[PDB]
Every structure is written in structure tokens, then in C-alpha cells.
Enzyme design. Structure first.
Site, short mmCIF file in Angstrom:
data_model
loop_
_atom_site.label_atom_id
_atom_site.label_comp_id
_atom_site.label_asym_id
_atom_site.label_seq_id
_atom_site.Cartn_x
_atom_site.Cartn_y
_atom_site.Cartn_z
N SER A 1 0.82 -1.20 0.00
CA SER A 1 0.00 0.00 0.00
C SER A 1 0.85 1.26 0.00
CB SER A 1 -0.98 0.02 1.16
OG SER A 1 -0.34 0.29 2.39
N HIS B 1 6.82 -13.08 12.64
CA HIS B 1 7.12 -12.45 11.37
C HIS B 1 8.59 -12.03 11.41
CE1 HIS B 1 2.80 -12.12 9.59
NE2 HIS B 1 2.76 -12.97 10.60
N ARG C 1 3.91 -1.80 19.07
CA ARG C 1 2.53 -1.50 18.73
C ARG C 1 1.61 -2.52 19.40
NH1 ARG C 1 2.87 -1.47 12.37
NH2 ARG C 1 3.71 -3.45 13.10
N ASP D 1 -0.95 -6.71 14.76
CA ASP D 1 -2.20 -7.30 14.27
C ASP D 1 -2.69 -8.41 15.20
OD1 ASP D 1 -2.21 -5.57 11.85
OD2 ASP D 1 -0.70 -7.01 11.09
#
Ligand SMILES: CC(=O)SCCNC(=O)CCNC(=O)[C@H](O)C(C)(C)COP(=O)(O)OP(=O)(O)OC[C@H]1O[C@@H](n2cnc3c(N)ncnc32)[C@H](O)[C@@H]1OP(=O)(O)O
Ligand SMILES: CC(C)(COP(=O)(O)OP(=O)(O)OC[C@H]1O[C@@H](n2cnc3c(N)ncnc32)[C@H](O)[C@@H]1OP(=O)(O)O)[C@@H](O)C(=O)NCCC(=O)NCCS
Ligand SMILES: O=C([O-])CC(=O)C(=O)O
Ligand SMILES: O=C([O-])CC(=O)C(=O)O
Ligand SMILES: O=C([O-])CC(=O)C(=O)O
Lengths: 442, 441, 440, 441
Positions: free
Chosen positions: A244, A320, A329, A375
Site C-alpha cells: 500500500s 514475522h 505496537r 495485528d
């Protein structure tokens, strides 16, 4: 407006510095480009510039040098809403653009700018949104609505009338103010029409940007405003190499305005490999809850994690590559759940996971990083406060990441970076030449 | 459809080959990556794979190994319309996908699939187009209409039903047939509403894809059909590194379907630095004709060119860095004009330019190439036949370029290339470390 | 198109003749301008030019020198539909423009041009009409639909690009072809939306203009086609001075295109003193038939006529501004009715009125014309064939009157007549000077 | 409302006076009618009655006997806004109808009536406006919206029901009040949709009529409110004989309601030779400014005037059908510029034009009036305050001119004047007869 007067001083310096970097050190080599890179999605290849955020594989993402904790609490704290704790995205944005920490006033100016322009979404944008069947995916509706607003682009207008390259960033700032102001309105419109009986709530001119998004979706609790503010802060930016952010730069590089570049970017964010993790994690968590008729014990959750990994599956939101520590985060959002919803069942599972799962990923020993990312935490937060519309989660993401994308695009246009034009190669040529080619090194 | 049966045999082979090439030659170095690439829009950086077309500096672009002469005239001529000379994009598309030359049957199957599917543009697509104010840029309308059609995506739906990567290319193909069929209808709708008094002409089920676009825009002369077929052919593909083809690939790399990738690609085409060149050329030719009250003489043109070059300008349509010979796409178009409209006055200027500008560019000696490209010829052809709406020229471009974008997207999803995730770098890091970096060599 | 090739010769000629007239005869007096003219709607004032038609007090209208009988019956009979008797308005329009009688082939050209351009009504015109609430008066709908089409005006575009006065007629012709082709489509759309349940019928490509209106309105019948052809012939034109024709000239004289000038005109035709009389006649005829349970006796009719006048009303369909004899437009519809529906009872009342009402009005001694005009006869014809939407009658009028409006605007732009801008006067001035003025 | 109470006494008096005049002075001669009149647009022919205003060839307009200076500054200065200087159109309107100068209170009665009915524009008018493509010319949009609102006419409803001729002026007044209230809303909707991103500002109930129009367009400076007040005042009315006023009377004469008569009049105002000149003036100044890249010399402007004359075009903003002197509406606007924007570039060009263009038009020898008219000056005033969309300028004119059109229609239905129906003549007749006719002296 402080934000502009400041950029009027910094951007010509930065432009001069980038001109100097190109002339003097253009021929400095950073790495070898391999066949592998071409067939491997350019993975690793140092091809892009981004000055708004940087991932340190030890510490986590940092916004213009500053850690996330630093900006959420303590003497480096970004300005809040009156009576609030969570840092306003408005001030975050000031930081990404200037590399400087904003004052209280600096942020109230941005909030006012977003509030005034939030009233200037064209009627035809809604006409366009209403023309789309209601069962269209929210990310299609979102990008389409953004694209239609392209008629109001000041950059396109000014480009066509004749404008110096020196003024590009000004027109990009003006369009970014307009489009950022529009996004909560468009997003809310989509939310209300699809999910809440096509009843529409107008902007409150006393709320900040994130809170207005919440208000216009139909949530008015203080805690939800605070969640929205944090959410928008944390997800604002993450380098320039993600699909993105990259799409944004690419389309921007041809002098296409922010409505074109950003809506393109959203088409990218809508892809299943870029935009769904949040949701998959949540769906998993809820499956756990259904499986064990409640929160599982430490033992049951180890047994399940082992069986998942042994049938070759992944644990969502964990492991990841890029980091080697826990995502700040994630930590920020854990902090928030512990404060405002500690007895939420689904969050208890997320909490149990943070304890169990990295111990199982370490002893399985298949992940060089066993720690969670942003996430892993967001879904339960939304769900707890009654935002339960999974598909829409990617729209929320998109709303936040516009902070990063607009800041980036204003800057690279301020720097006057040229068109993005790599060279493609054919397999024909690979097969001709590969033997004759040096190994990486020599 | 033979095309499908064929891709069924070929794509597994290509998938295994590409796996092997990555394993065995991944570590082979092609060039140095520099600071200069990162701040220079990656100029030259061999970062992408595109097997549909390749540019040769001394010959020009080639489609799957074949030159434009080979396909248009030469010993491997592509099928034409009945009665026609110009190559059908339908067969070029077959070639881009399979790497093999179509039979007459193969082209008719594709023509027939595009015709059937041209009836399946949803009503809501028109609703969306109509909801946009009529003075909206046509490339915004074009991209928005395509994007709205994302709801019919077979890829999207099958991905959520759960489908193996192995079948990606099939869904991509299906969507690609639907979208390509729709592009002429969407483009025509925009043309008719903006420029032709909002009167709407339906597809003719007996016309090929290119001709139908002309038909739906309100042009039925055989020459115009022939122009449209050629145009669509020449413009179909030009490697994968250009903004639009790259945007297509980039968004595709996230498993976004063809409607999202192609609409995104069109947003990049809409960019002033990517999409405007043939318009700029045409207005340039138009200004010359105004200035000299007709076709300039050799001598007037030379003076004006030297004047141009001596005020630091460039001559539009000439002197691009990659080719060192005349673009064959220009040659084919010149051949068309000489044959069909040799007394058109704006053509006479373009033809004169072909003689004069290269000589002036040789003497001036600044150009490593004195020769023209496609964009130097395409305007006067369109204008000749009464397509005079400059802004819409980029939409025609877009329509053509969907042939390549679809083909490339079908292919790389067959290959199962991974997501495109380059690494970004900070000016802060560069300013720190630059002095301590080796120089490329 | 022969029509164009002809105008290309004629208009340059006529333009020079008009130049010559203004130069050589400009100061030639026609009449006295009086105070009565200014307060009296200009009655009698030779203020305008119209070469399409002239209304003779003692004879009726003449189209370029030719009477209605001359053009409908012979010996200068215009072309018809194949197998038809009634003159096609396409042919009348040709004659209004050139002053020359069309051949068969000249009329097919125009029919084919209307048919072709009929397919070119913009989608947004329908959008506009549908946005109007369905109870909107149909003359309101009609004028709005026409006006919206002003975006496709060639005159307007060319004016802005830059064109000399000599080129005006060509732009006016192109717009007039487009608009005339459009009017039947727009009218039908209004009719079908208002009155026939919003189902829509396309042009039939082998019908002439008049019969296409009937077809699209839902009436496929030879007699109906014939009626419409006649109807459109008859209401086409009636000098320059009526409200619709004059409105058209006025707005045209400031270089406003045909969509503007014609929509304005329809706003004037929508007015009760200009366009409603057809309807008022029918209603009055229907009132008679109701009261007396059928066709009245001559006695019953005379009483009802006297009762109409004593209650302060006009007898509708009788009298005229300038006509002083039976209107030839009436007579032509009488011939149609005698031929095709002589036993129709409403018609019988209309026919009986022709024998009785003029006597009444002569004795009454007010009306300067005691004889029928066109509006006396049209309603009972339409009603007979199943067109009963009273308010819509004025739309049919509008479609016809477009024929004369277009022709006149084209011509007057060909001539290059200037802006219409007379001088006004005040009642204060009049009162001060009236005694000192000469008498006329 | 005082206005109505006053009309209820005055109109019967005027009705009777008129009837008497028709009866007693019908055959009084005012002048000769000539072939020249029929072929020359009735120029000079005293063919109409108007009591609102009278245009003197050598002095310009008087409203009910009062000059512009008299009503703007002079001994008979109309009421302003609070803290204002410029006269309010609301008070001028009261003068136009009654012949009497309004009080403070009488003007506030009208302002309030406009404000209240501003809220009653039907939703369907906005639907009609939006149904029109956004690139439709403003004057077409304006006329169409006005026309759509005919559905709400009290006069047409009362006429259909049966109403005496004596109640005509009452229904016309009711409709005028409603329509006048609507015009700013309608005009501002068009402005916003076309030129300001299709966002809409509601009326402010604390503003007078003119200011509210600015407000709803997006402009809230006092000086802008003052400009609009002066503008609405200056363009209100100009005798009966101008194309817009006359079109309004003509259509009114057949008993068409104000929505029909005024939309009709707007189709006339939209003509290049009538109101559209205020647009044409600016387009022309723009072309000037581009040709000489700035404020041109006397010689360059001279050359430019002549080139427009020689190309068979009119020089907008000069000339008049009755005026034979500089237009006092012009002088008024110059006054406004000298006070408020004396250093503006465009204003400098307008000032220059005032010296040069009359000179050119004298030498060219055709114009009966070489001096500037109202439309020469109006555009530059708006442009200064950031209203630069010159295609909209004739809509502003229309809003103003509705004042005169409403005042005339009300009065003339009060007087009970008949249908307008002059006699046309043929050219054939003129040829045959002309030699025999007397010369007029
Ligand atoms: C409607 C309003 O609010 S104000 C005035 C109209 N606005 C404009 O500025 C339009 C330009 N002006 C003109 O065309 C004229 O002055 C008009 C519109 C007022 C027409 O009035 P007329 O009484 O016909 O003008 P006039 O008697 O001066 O015409 C005589 C000749 O002078 C010419 N003329 C007059 N004014 C101009 C002008 N400004 N530019 C060029 N020629 C002109 C006429 O075209 C005519 O030429 P012609 O003999 O070849 O036909
Ligand atoms: C058409 C018409 C309006 C023209 O009227 P005009 O020009 O004023 O006609 P005149 O010069 O004959 O009028 C003189 C008088 O006779 C009267 N008169 C004329 N025709 C009349 C009629 N058909 N019934 C009753 N009285 C009539 C007028 O009202 C006027 O009365 P007044 O003296 O009390 O004011 C008039 O003949 C009339 O009103 N006709 C009826 C409506 C109609 O059918 N119109 C169709 C027009 S094509
Ligand atoms: O033709 C173009 O669009 C340019 C191009 O392909 C490229 O540079 O790769
Ligand atoms: O002539 C008139 O004035 C009235 C009329 O019949 C018409 O317009 O046809
Ligand atoms: O045009 C006219 O004849 C009078 C007028 O309104 C004007 O100057 O506006």
C-alpha cells in the site's frame, strides 16, 4: 498554519540535501541486485526512500526517530484530547512531516483544519457511493469514493494550469488536508449504509479526527474515542516498502494526485496478503473460545499450539521475520486492554497467548522471531466495543495508513524524486546469461 | 477455448522452470544496487520479471520474441478481420499469454468470448459512471467504473471460498476475459456522455473487440476500424517496468484481483509523466500548422527545431534514451498514414518531421537517439478520423494496455511469484554511511 | 440535403435584398404609432418581419403566398404519406424556408433527417423530465426538456468559438433539425409518463414525423396518422406577431439559440390567452352534450350560447385578433371530419355551431369576427380518436408551431436582423403630453 | 405587509387611469412607424408601457423619476444594511411597485418576507438541477430550475380554478415573493455544484437578500455583501424595452405565470447581445491579457479592438439600444472600484478601455453609442473578490433583474393590459409597396 510555515522552511533544505546526496554519493553501492530479487518480489532490495518511519530489528518501528512508548507517555508524549490519555493522530502527522514534536497549539490547528474540511465532502461522492450495490466490499467502496473526489484535486488543477516543481508539495499538502478530512466521512458513510440501517450521523465539529470517525459510525463512549485515537496512531505508517505504501509512492511518482495514488494504494491494501491479518487473528481467538467453551488453561493452549504447528500451520499474528523483539505496537495495545477491559474473555485468551505461544515457538524452534505484531492485538479491541464487522477492519487500517501515505507523498514531491521506473527482465534473457553471470559478491 | 487448454499445459511447465531458475541461479548478480537507484526511481534496476515483451535497443520492442514487422506484415502475420490488413489484438493477446502464434480459429474463439461478455457489464457500473459529474477527468471515470466492477470478480470470490494457488491463473483468466470485454463498453460510455451528447450505441455482436470500441464511440468507417485494430496492437505492451504495468503487478502481488490492479494501474497512467505524450505531440504539430499558416517548408521547420533546441527545449516524440533506431511502432503507423491518409496536412508535418528532426538532432549531437517513438505518430491518426478529445487519448492507451496487463497478471499468478516487498532506506542512514560505502565497480 | 443547398443560394440573395430595403426605404412610413398601440399590446402595429406566412383579414393564412386549399387539395398540393391524402408538415417546412414547393424527394430527405436525428435525444433530457414531479403541467415539462437540450446547441458553441453573422443561419438550421427531431420524442415521453403508465415506445424508423408522434404516444391508425399530419400542417405558423412566434423572434434577436428561444415560446403558448382555446371549446361542447342528453336543437344551442355570454364568458373557438372570415384552418378540419367521422355527436355539435353561433355573435354585436377559428374544431377530432388528455393538447400545438418558429429564426438570422429593443413610455409622460399630440 | 396594503389602494387608481387613457387618448400619435422599425428591431418605436423605470438616451435610467445618485447617496438615499452604505434592492423594489420611497420598516418587511420563503424551495427543483449535466451553462440551469418551480404557481392554480381579473395582481405578488426568495438559493446551488466542489451552504436568516446570496456562494466579507447589494440594485430594472423585460411582459400578456414569464426572460438575458455580455466582457479582457502577457499599451489595445471588429465580432460592454452616453450604472460601478479596489490590475484595463474603446468605436463609425454600458464594469468587481467564474455572471444579473420583471408583471396585470400581438409584414409586400409610401419626418 504552523505545519505549513515549518514545511516552507524545511523542505527546501531537504531538497538541497537530496540533490547533494544524488550528485556526490549516487554511485555508492549498498548491495548486489540478483536474479533472485527479480523473481522474489524485490525482497531485501534497497530500492526506495522513506524518512517518516524506520524499522530497527532490535527495538521496533520508530516515527522520525522516536519510539512508540515515548510518544504515548512521558516527556515526549504527543498532545491528547482534552481529558484524554492516548496521543492524537493529528500530532503524529505533524511529526512525520516535520521530524519535530508538535506543541498543543500545533495539534489544535491540524484538528481544526480537518474539522472545517470534513464539511466539504462533495454530494456527488455520496451519489457515487450509493450507486454501488450495498453488498460491494467495503474496501472497493472506500477506494472508489476516494477516487471520485479526484475532481477536487488542487494538484491536478495547478499542474495543468502550470506550476513549478517547487510548489508541488504545497498542492499535495492542500489535497492531503482535504482527503484526510474526507476519509472518516466516506468510511462512516460506508459503515452506516452497509451495517447500521442506512442512518447517517454528521460530523461533530467539537471532536478530533479519530473521535469523529467513531461518532459518525455511532460510538460515543470516551473509551472508544481513546481506542480510535491509539489505533490511528499505531497504524499510521511502517516504512515505504509494504504494498500500500509502495503503490502510493509509485503512482505518485508519475505526478498522479493523492486521490489517485491513495485509492490505488487502497486497492493494494485490499489484497488478502496485505490487509487481513487483524481479522484472521480475531477469528482464531474466537474459534479457541468456541472450542474450549471458554478461556483455555495454560496446558490446553500449549496442546493446541503444538498440534497447530505440527500439522504445518501458522499461529496468527506471531512470528514475522523482520523483528527480533515484541512489537511496541502490540505492547501499546496490551497496555490499553489491561487498563480498560482486563476481564474481557477474548482478551484473556490474547493475554494467555502472549505468555504461552513464544515459549512454544521457541521450543518448536522454526521461527527466528517468536514474538507478536500489532495485528495480534487490534481485533479483540474493536470487537469488545461492538465494532464487529471484520471486512470493515481493513477500512479502519486504511484510514490510519493515510497519515503515513500522505506525509510520504508530500515529502518525496518536496524532495522532487523522479518517476519510479525499474527495469524488467525476461526469463529468455535469464536463461541466456545466467551461467555467464558472477555469483553474488565477486 | 484452446487458449485455456494450452495454458493448462504450459503454465505448470513454466512454474517448475521458474522454481528451478530461482534455486539454481537466484544468487547470480545482475548489477550493483546504489544509493542512486533509491533516490532515482530505481532507474535501470533489474527488479521485475516480465515475459510478455522485451525492448531491444537496436530493433525495438518485441512480443514473445516476434518483431512488429513479423506480426503485422512479415512471415508470421497475425490474423486480420475478414477483408482487413491490420493485426487483431485478439491474436496478439493469445501470443502474449501462450508464447505461441494463434490459428484463425484461436482468434475467433477470443473474439467470440469478448463479444458474448460485452453484454455482461452490470447496470450498477453505468449508475456509478453517471453519478460522477460529467466534467470529471475521463481516466478517473475509466478507473472508477472498472473498480466498481470488482464485485463480479471471480478471483475475489474463489479466494474467500478457499482455492489453491495452483488455480490462481484460471480465475485471473476468467476475470481477464470479463474485464477486457467490459473495457470498450465503459470507455465508449464515457466518450458518448462527455463528448457526443449522451447518446448510447450498443455493441455490435458481429464486430471484433477493437472495431466495437469504434462502433460504440460512433465511428463505422472500415479505415477507422483498421486504425483501432492497429492502435490496440501497437500499444498493448511495453515490458513491466513502466508505472502502469508495474502498478498492475504490484497490487496483483497482494492477491488483489484484476479489477483492483488494473484500476490502480490506470490511476498511474492518468499521471502527467506517463499518459500524455501523444497529446503533447499532436498539439505541437497543431501549433506548427498555426504558426506557418500551413505545412512549413524544410527550412522553416529546421529553423524552428534549432530555435527549440537552442532554448533548451526538446522536440516532442523524439530522442528517447532506450532505443537507438526508429521505433517500429512509429514505422507501422507511418505505413498506415502513407497508405490511408497521405494528404492529411497534420500528417504532412509529421512526415516532414521524420526527415528533418533526426538530421537536426544528429548535428546538435546532444541526443544519443535522434529518432521518434510511437507517440510521435499516434495523435494525427486519431485526429484525422475525428477522435479529437485529447484527454480521452489516455483512455484509448489504457484500453490497449489492458491486453498486456492482463497477460502479465495471469502469467505471474501462474508462476506464483511472491508479494512485492522492496526495502526502503532513510536519508538519515545514507547521510551517516555514504562516505564509508564502496563506489560501484 | 436539397433544403440546405437551396438556402445556400437563397439566403445570400435575400440578405442583400433586405440590406437594400433598410438603406433605400428605411424612412418610409407605414402607419402612425399611437398611445393605443403602447397600452394595447401593439394591435395593428407593423413592428415585425415574417416571410414564412401572412394572415389576410378577409382570406386567412397564406404560407409563402399559398392558401391551405391550394396546398391540401390543389392545384399546388404538397406531398403526402404513401397512400395518404393529408399534406406532410416536412413538406410545409421546406416551403416555409425556401418559398419553393418541395418535390416528393425533397420531403423524403427531411423525413429521413428527422428520423435519423430522433435517435439523438440525450439521456440527460429524460433524466431531467423524470426529476419533474409527474403532476407538473405538461407544457412546463415540455419547455424544460427542450431547454435542457440547450447544452447540445451548435449555435451556442460556434458563437463562442467565433463566427461571422453570415454563418448564423447554418448553425440555426443544424440546431433546428436536431430539436425538431427531438420534440416528438420529448412530447411522447411526457404523454406516456403522465397518462399511459410510464411505458415507453421507440420511434418506428419507417414513419414520418407526425405519425411517429402518434406511434410513440400509442396510436397506430391510418386515420390518426392522417389527423396528426393535418394537425401539424395547420398549426405550423400564423405570422410573426402571435405570442409564441414573437417570443421566439425576441429571444432569438439577442443571439440566443433555438433551444432557448423555442422553450421561451412554449412558455408563452402555455398561457391561457394563447394556447388553451382548443380545450375550452371541447369542454364547452361536452357541457352542451351533457345538459341536453345528446345533440341539441338549434333552439337549445342558441339559449346555451346566450347563457354563456350573459354569465360574462366568451363563446370559445370563435373570433380572432385579425381574421374576419371563417378560418381556413377550421375549414380544413371540417373537411377531415365530414370525410372520416360525420356521425360523431360532438362533431355534430361543432357543425351545428357553424350554422348558429355566428348569428348569435353578430346580434350580440361585440365580436369583430363572428366566425370560427382553428381552435373550434381540433378538440373533437382528437377526442374522437382517443386523445383525451386536455392539457396535453397544447403540447401537440407546441410540436407543430416549432415548424414555423424554426423556419423564421433561421431566416431572420440569414437576413441578419438586429436585436428587438423598442422604447417604453410612462403613464406620467403620457398624461403630461397627451393633449398636445396630433390625432392619427 | 405595508407593500400590499399600499398596492391595494394604488392599483385600482392606476387601473382606472389607464382605462381612461386608452379611451380618451387611444388615437393620440406619438411618432411615425417605418419600414426601418420592422427591419431594425423596433429601434426607437414607442411600442411598450413601463412605469417602474425609464431610460433616457442622454442621462440613463430613472427609477420612478429618481436617478441612481439620488437613491445611492443623494437627498433620497434608500435604506442600507446596518452599518452599510450601498442601497438595498428590497427598498428599490418597494419604490418600483408603489412609486413611493420606503421607510426603514418597509424594507425590513420585505427582507423578512424574502427570508421566510427562502426555506420553501421544493426538493424536486434541486433534483431537476442535478439531473442536468454539471457542464451545462449556468443560465440554462437557472432558467430550468425557475421553470420547474412553476408547479407551485399560485397564479396558475387560481386561474385554473376561476378567479376574477381583479385578483390577478395579488396572485402575481404572492408568486413573485416566492420566486424572488428562491432565486438566490437556486443561483447559489448552481454556483456551488459547478465551481465549489458541490458542497452547499444554507441561508442565514439574519442576512438581507443580496448578502445571503454571497453567503450561500461562500463569500462573507462585508465589502462583498456591499458589492452584491449595489449589484442587485443596479441591475434591477431598465424600462420595458430590453429583451429580458420585454420577454417577461410578452409571455405575461398571455396570462402565463411569473415562473414561465421570468424563465423565458432569462433565456433572453442569456443572449450574447443582452445580459451575456457581462460574461463576454471578461472573456474578451482575458484574451487581451494573454495576448500581451499583461496590461497592454494604448496601441496594443487599439489593434486588439480593431481585430475583433474586423473578424465580425462585437466588442462586449459598449453600445446600447437607447443609451447615447456613458451608462450611469457604469459610473456607479467605477465609483465603487475607485473607493474599494483602485489598484486592481483588471480594473486598470477597464479604466484604459474607457479611454480607448469609445475612440475606436467612433472611428469605426457604426455604433450609435460608443460608450460603455453596465456589463463593461461588473465582471471586474466580482473577480477582485475571488468570484472569477465569468460564465456565472449573467445569473447574478438575472437574480437582480427579477426585481424589475416582478414589479412590471404585477403592475401590468393590475392595469389589465391585453395580449401583445403586433402585426408582421412580408418582404414581398415591402418591395411592391415601398415606392408609394411617404417619407417620415
Ligand atoms: C443587454 C445589456 O445589459 S447592455 C448592451 C448589450 N451588451 C453588449 O455589450 C453587446 C455589444 N453591443 C452591441 O452589440 C450593441 O451596442 C447592442 C447590443 C446594444 C445593439 O444595439 P443596436 O441599437 O443594434 O446598436 P447600434 O444602433 O449601435 O448598431 C449599429 C451598428 O453598430 C454596431 N455596434 C454597436 N455596438 C457595437 C459594439 N460594441 N461592438 C461592435 N459593433 C457594435 C452594430 O453591430 C451595428 O453594425 P451593423 O450596422 O453592421 O449591423
Ligand atoms: C380570440 C379573441 C380573444 C380575440 O379578441 P379581440 O381581439 O379582443 O376581439 P374583438 O376585437 O372582436 O373584441 C371586441 C369585443 O368582442 C368580444 N368577443 C370577441 N369574440 C368573442 C367571443 N367568441 N365570445 C364573446 N365575446 C367575444 C370581446 O370580448 C370584446 O368584448 P369587450 O368589447 O366587452 O371587451 C376573441 O375573439 C375571443 O375572446 N375568442 C374566444 C376564445 C378563443 O376561442 N380564442 C382562440 C384564438 S385563435
Ligand atoms: O511505453 C511506456 O509506457 C514506457 C515503458 O514501457 C517503459 O519505460 O518501460
Ligand atoms: O394568430 C394568432 O395570433 C392566434 C393564433 O391563431 C395562432 O397563433 O395560431
Ligand atoms: O438592454 C437593454 O436594452 C436595456 C438593458 O437592460 C440593459 O442595458 O440591460
Amino acid at each position: 498554519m504552523k505545519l505549513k510555515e515549518r514545511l516552507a522552511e524545511l523542505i527546501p533544505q531537504w531538497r538541497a540535501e537530496v540533490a547533494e546526496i544524488r550528485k556526490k554519493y549516487g554511485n555508492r553501492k549498498t548491495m548486489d541486485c540478483t536474479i533472485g530479487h527479480a523473481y522474489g518480489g524485490m525482497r531485501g532490495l534497497k530500492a526506495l526512500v522513506c524518512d517518516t518511519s524506520e524499522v530497527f530489528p532490535d527495538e521496533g518501528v520508530k516515527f522520525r526517530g522516536y519510539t512508540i512508548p515515548e510518544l504515548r507517555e512521558g516527556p515526549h508524549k504527543l498532545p491528547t484530547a482534552e481529558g484524554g490519555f492516548e496521543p492524537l493522530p493529528e500530532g503524529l502527522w505533524y511529526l512525520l512531516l516535520t521530524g519535530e514534536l508538535p506543541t498543543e497549539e500545533d495539534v489544535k490547528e491540524i484538528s481544526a483544519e480537518f474539522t472545517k474540511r470534513m464539511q466539504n465532502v462533495p454530494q456527488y461522492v455520496f451519489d457515487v457511493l450509493r450507486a454501488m450495490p450495498v453488498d460491494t466490499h467495503p474496501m472497493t467502496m472506500f477506494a472508489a469514493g476516494i477516487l471520485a473526489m479526484q475532481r477536487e484535486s488542487v494538484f491536478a488543477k495547478r499542474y495543468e494550469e502550470g506550476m513549478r516543481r517547487e510548489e508541488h508539495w504545497e498542492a499535495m499538502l492542500e489535497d492531503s488536508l482535504n482527503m484526510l478530512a474526507a476519509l472518516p466521512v466516506i468510511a462512516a458513510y460506508i459503515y452506516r449504509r452497509k451495517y447500521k440501517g442506512d442512518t447517517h450521523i454528521a460530523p461533530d465539529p467539537n471532536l478530533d479526527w479519530s473521535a469523529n470517525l467513531a461518532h459518525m459510525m455511532g460510538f460515543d463512549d470516551f473509551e472508544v474515542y481513546e481506542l480510535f485515537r491509539l489505533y490511528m496512531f499505531l497504524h499510521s505508517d511502517h516504512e515505504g516498502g509494504n504494498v500500500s505504501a509502495h503503490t502510493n509512492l509509485l503512482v505518485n511518482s508519475a505526478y498522479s494526485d493523492i486521490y489517485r495514488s491513495f485509492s490505488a494504494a487502497m486497492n493494494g491494501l485490499a489484497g488478502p496478503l496485505h490487509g487481513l491479518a487483524n481479522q484472521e487473528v480475531l477469528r482464531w481467538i474466537q474459534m479457541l473460545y468456541k472450542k474450549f467453551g471458554g478461556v483455555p488453561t495454560k496446558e490446553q493452549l500449549e496442546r493446541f499450539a503444538w498440534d497447530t504447528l505440527n500439522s504445518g500451520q501458522v499461529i496468527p499474528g506471531y512470528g514475522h521475520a523482520v523483528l527480533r523483539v515484541t512489537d511496541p505496537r502490540y505492547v501499546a495495545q496490551r497496555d490499553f486492554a489491561l487498563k480498560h477491559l482486563p476481564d474481557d474473555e477474548l482478551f484473556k485468551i490474547v493475554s494467555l497467548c502472549y505468555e504461552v505461544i513464544p515459549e512454544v515457538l521457541k521450543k518448536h524452534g522454526k521461527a527466528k522471531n517468536p514474538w507478536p505484531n500489532v495485528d495480534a492485538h487490534s481485533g479483540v479491541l474493536l470487537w469488545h466495543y461492538g465494532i464487529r464487522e471484520y471486512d470493515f477492519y481493513t477500512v479502519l487500517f486504511g484510514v490510519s495508513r493515510a497519515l503515513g501515505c500522505t506525509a510520504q507523498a508530500i515529502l518525496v514531491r518536496g524532495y522532487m524524486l523522479p518517476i519510479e521506473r525499474p527495469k524488467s527482465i525476461t526469463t529468455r534473457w535469464v536463461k541466456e546469461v545466467a551461467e555467464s553471470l558472477p555469483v553474488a559478491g565477486s
